[PDB]
RNA sequence: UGAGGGCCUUGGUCACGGCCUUGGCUUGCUACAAUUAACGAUCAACUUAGAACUGGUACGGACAAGGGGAAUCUGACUGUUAACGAG
């Protein structure tokens, strides 16, 4: 049976996750607007801040790189640099008019989000 | 003097293009003036309410119903030949 691990709070309600292909990086979304990374641990070792709204969607690019989403219309790409590290928003992806709720990456480097606005 | 963008560039890395690093228009915090911004800019609102041409007025010049005047007698009856009566 899958038995009960660890379990470490946030300040807010979360709304995503994601770990990634090959890591132990826990990254989690939550609806104040901060995109926080875990060592496995309850300890945050990243955070992503720069988002107007809640989070929806976070996603694992690379080892540097992260794309998250949510009710601003907004994809919102962030570096680090490979205590608490404190990520900078690389690029801002806009277009959609309503909250951004999902996103996916693929192998060729692109990017497929779903929002509200039936798009 | 800190931040974010733009043009540069230096090495390692993966078949002109990614990944990791190196040094040089917007806004944030402080210092001296201005506080007659009592100024300027921009968006938005706004069109001409006037109609009618009635009469009576004071004045200037002819009509206006139609024979007049005076006094006595007489009939109800005041304050100067009193008046009045379709006698």
Redesign the pocket.
């Known amino acids: 049976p899958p038995s009960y691990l660890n379990s470490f709070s946030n300040e807010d309600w979360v709304s995503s996750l994601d770990v990634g292909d090959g890591s132990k990086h826990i990254i989690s979304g939550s609806y104040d607007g901060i995109v926080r990374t875990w060592d496995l641990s309850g300890n945050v070792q990243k955070q992503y801040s720069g988002h107007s709204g809640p989070i929806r969607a976070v996603k694992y690019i690379?080892?540097?790189?992260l794309v998250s989403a949510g009710n601003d219309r907004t994809l919102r790409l962030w570096?680090?640099?490979?205590n608490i590290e404190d990520g900078?928003?690389?690029?801002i992806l806009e277009g959609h008019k309503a909250p951004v709720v999902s996103i996916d990456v693929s192998d060729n480097?692109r990017i497929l989000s779903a929002s509200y606005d039936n798009s």
């Not at 570096?79 to 490979?82: L, M, V």
């Not at 900078?88 to 690029?91: G, P």
């Open positions: 690379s080892n540097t790189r570096k680090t640099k490979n900078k928003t690389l690029a480097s």
